[model samples]
Target: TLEKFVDALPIPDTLKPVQQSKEKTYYEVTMEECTHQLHRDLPPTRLWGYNGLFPGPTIEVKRNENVYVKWMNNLPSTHFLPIDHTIHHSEEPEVKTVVHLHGGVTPDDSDGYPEAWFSKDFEQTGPYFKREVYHYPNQQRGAILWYHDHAMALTRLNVYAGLVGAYIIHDPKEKRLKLPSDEYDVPLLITDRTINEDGSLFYPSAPENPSPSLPNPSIVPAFCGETILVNGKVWPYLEVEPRKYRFRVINASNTRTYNLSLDNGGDFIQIGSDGGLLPRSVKLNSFSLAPAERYDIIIDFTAYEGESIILANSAGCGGDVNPETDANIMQFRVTKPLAQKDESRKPKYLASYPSVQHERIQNIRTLKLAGTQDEYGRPVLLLNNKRWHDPVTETPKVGTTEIWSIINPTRGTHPIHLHLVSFRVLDRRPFDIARYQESGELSYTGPAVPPPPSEKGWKDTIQAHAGEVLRIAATFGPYSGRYVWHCHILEHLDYDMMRPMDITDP
Candidate 1:
């Protein structure tokens, strides 16, 4: 028997459809104004939500099953979060949103193409809009895959305003592993937010905002916030018995990189990362994860009896310039000793596809990220020294393995994320900034260094630091269309740091 728990998981109220019995199951979702207690003693205030709740609902399905979802907007015309059209926008009005099933292998239309955004009352839609219903064939069986708004330039604000949720796909093979049974497996959606004195959300901006600014101007790029949210609640806590628990943690923060650890110094048995399970489990005390990355880890609470352990995010991950002040994002209290019968659970190995070799590499390309100052004196993140609207520079043949040399010159680390396919980190080395800038030299410090344990497997996103050159090898799948590759930091992605990569067989 399985222990199934489905409490009040928040979901957006909009019209969408799912595949049921080979037919589309159309449903309507709407966002209503409501408030729930996120912090104790703090009065509940107005907040935008889907179906009257924040963080939306948890969508679960089986592998290889096809699902059709049709999302319809029913909220009022006014947008809940702040909007900066000067960054990225279409000609249409009414906050536009496209649902990108992050990490889902779907077709172009269902890929949540930014241009596929739709507006309220069906008055206008993105040019790439194909149908109201989306077909998601549960292709990748994994944990902690999520859906969020991908509207051009509005993704940061839309997701911050409560437009994200979990989409979990399970496989019978993984179930048989029996690492953790019911009541032991949990999905943790982690995000960050800044609250006003009145408990409302706060988003700051720099003076002399760019977009409209012209010759010899100034600009300031946004930075990480002060507060962190776990499952839509600040400083939340979970009660657990003394036993091993499987935690499917998803990093949904806009810009913050979490170096997660246990307050009591418990080891984190990392069984999986990003797209799927690793070949073997690795035990670690602390691990770093950036936005859009997911880690499937198991922590044994057998040592702690009647003691509380805090799930703390360490300070200054990804070599961030601004040191992190807030640490504890959530807590776990060990209530009682584990039952003797519960000792049956153990981590079992799962099968994973091996990485393609260099001989199999069909193509190789190099991408240069050029940095400049915006009108507000803020650093501008760019791919190939061009903005998002610029013409696509790198196109690869489908099913071909190619090497991408990602060059980063900024002072901070940027987690670069690619849609549609997963890759392996071949190597990373230091590059000379002055030589590259003046003489366009391809110099390096030493031989390529191998990837970390968490990065050894397939990845959809990888972190690149300043003066670092990261080389990745990847094979383009059959999804032949235009997709995006950009810094996973939502703020950087919004500020023209993203670019399009087209895949074609020919």
Candidate 2:
């Protein structure tokens, strides 16, 4: 078994642009195959990363900055992880990549459409290929965004092999808050993995109930790793001064969700969410973080000086969290001496609250989260019972507000994510799943419950619990073209649980 808390947490350096000017900033990030030791005792594991770094260099930009990223693919032609050819009918190249800024409110050409993938040196491009470089207007609020591979049908394998990084947009207006700045601001990227005895990354190539007659690399419905990693190191530790520090915690795992708490019974002052700083700060003992979700929190270590606090996880994957294993995320040792008297402030008033829009709802669409079994009996989740290539039916008028009532009938919770726009979680209510599925009728089991203070602000990814209808309102504007809304769980996403969304201008 791999040892825990043996390595120091790695903070990915902030990336410097190749060329910069007052008008814009340009960067070149190449996807390459590299090897890195994930644990203290295990050998280096072969993986793919941006700029040859496991957790790629952090890219920071200013609000409304004209930033362009020439995301190049320089990896080998063959993939190290198992690829299920049966997932997609196309006989595409073995290696393909497209980078999607998880919460980027970008133009259509730079939105990183799954089919816009390209191979090494742009040798081969997908059908929807637009441009070699992507343009990020950075017009949205300052938030913890991320970049990851979004190739069609290969996203799960590609992302699991280590192609993810943090991208933060800074708003000069929020500087007055004086939250943690510079070195005090940290990004905690949490990913889970199952490593083999020989130190190779082990990804399942078959379903739980595998049949010898089925395809060799059959896809599983869900995956939960045996170990937890924070910023590329397994159960690493961080040294913190006896002062308040800001952490941008991102759940970059493929499927596993984490219910996090402090072992010392300390509270977390949450200042931001997926969209950006919340309307007001919230004090929480614990919070559930699903895949692709981000929590901007401040942990005050002033009273806990000289003590070691463990960031513990109570949520399990496939089963309960093993106290000796996935339970402990990382250790925060608050033993460092004070550096020049802490200047940061954990202010109660953070930013503008996402008040319910007063505009008329242009459309109210009801969608379903359900699945069907493949020929081999493996599950293939679908959004609204439609395939990826189906006619785009979720077309909304440009600059229009729409309320999407996502009905989750499945037994598990799915983190539903929408591209191009940040939305407000309106409310959710219990529904009769059996009756709705049988007669296409609505049967409410309970009253619609409003969102909590934690979910009052803007969000790009929201967890829709089973047997509930999650209602969210979003004004799809600024700029849009071809984008997608899918289950953030990479496994379900690749196995056809995604759909295309088009925003048209009348």
Candidate 3:
């Protein structure tokens, strides 16, 4: 294993737009294959990144701004990772790329439809390919958003190969609070990766005990790396001043959920969630973060001057976390002298709470999270027991609210995410999974429980625990034609666990 805390944390450079005017801001980002050192000891590792940088350049824009990004693919024609052809039959091309702005309220054409992919230099396009330039109106509230690959049946491998970045929508209205700005505000994009002895990326090519009938390079259900990375560096450490700082913490992991805490038991004041600022700040000693989940928090380091606090993790992959490796995320050294008197404030009242809407729910859909074995005895997780090419079953009228009840009978938590809009969590109730699976009858084992203070705000990705019925309410409005809702776990996302939702104008 590589030495821990030997590398300083890297903050991705903010992408400068190619063109900017009062009418619109235009930018161009290209996917390139590059080599970079992930740790101090290992040699340069090959990776696929945006603008030739892993955890790609952070793009910042003001709320209500007009933004257009032409995401281009310029990588080699062949893929470096193992491609499981048996998962999906494709005659088009082995390398496909599509960019999805997670949590962006974009138009249908720019939402990065899974089938709207393209190969190198646009030589080949998918069936649903539309325009090359994606338009983002930035009409929603300010939040910590991200962009990543969403190609069909290849999302897991593509994302794992290092194609992800932070895109934040800033609101000038929130400046009155003066939470933090300039160098004080930082973004920590956390990703886990496994590396070989020669500094090459390691991804499973097949599952264990492979049946003879099964094709080689079979897909695995889950993946958890042996080392943790923050902003593209392995086991990095950041130097912070002895004051308050705002951090946009993002879990860019594939399947593992992290239960994060400070080794010294420092409290984290959570001010925002997947959507935006919460109704009020909640002080927490630790919090659970699922895949694609974003937590905007403030950590006050006034009392911990001249001390180093390690960010520790308790969640494990496949089994218990090895204290020597996966248990530690990154370290924070509160040794930097304050530039000036600390002016940032961790306000108690952050934002307005999500009020009860007057509009009544027009429909209630009960979706089941279940899986069936493939011909080779491998599990194929499905949403509503349907494949990606299956007919769409979730149709909602524009400007109408609906309640989605997600039933999980499986043995793991699935981070459910929806495109086009943010939603509010209703509640979760325990149920008898064995009875429901055998008899197809619903039986409640416990009463419905409301979400805690940490989850009371708007959210785009939510954790639906096993053997529980998780409910959320969202309105389909503004502009939406075709979108998707699926398990944020990339493994399940590429294995037929995603489904399309249509918002009709009629």
- Angstrom error at residue 308, model 2: 0.7
TM-score of 3: 0.99
**1-506 per-residue lDDT for model 3 (tens digits):** 78899999999999999999999999999999999999999989999999999999999999999999999999988999999998887568889999999999999889999989999988899988899999999999999999999998999999999999999999999998899877889999999999998899999887766678777888989998999999999999999999999999999999989999999988999999999999999999999999999999999999999999999999988899988889999999999999999998999988888764566989999999997889988899999889888899999899999999999999999999999989999999999999999997889999999998989999999999999999999999789598889999998998879999899998
TM-score of each: 0.89, 0.99, 0.99
Q: Write the per-residue lDDT of candidate 1 for residues 209-325, one digit (tens) a residue.
A: 445543321213554666666777766667778888888788877878888898788898998877777777878999888888889889888778688887877756334433233
- In angstroms, the error of model 3 at 354 is 1.2
**Candidate 1 RMSD to the correct structure:** 5.1
Q: Write the per-residue lDDT of candidate 2 for residues 69-179, one digit (tens) a residue.
A: 999999999999998889897656899999999999998878889999999999999999989999999999999999999999999999999999999999999999999
Please give the clash total of every predicted structure, in order.
30, 0, 0
What TM-score does candidate 1 reach?
Answer: 0.89
| Candidate 2: residue 451 Cα off by (Å) | 1.0
Once fitted onto the true fold, the runs of candidate 1 whose alpha carbons sit more than 4 angstroms away are 1-19, 22-34, 89-91, 207-220, 317-325, 336-340, 343-348, 356-359, 375-378
Clashing pairs in 3: none
Supply candidate 2's per-residue lDDT for 126. 94
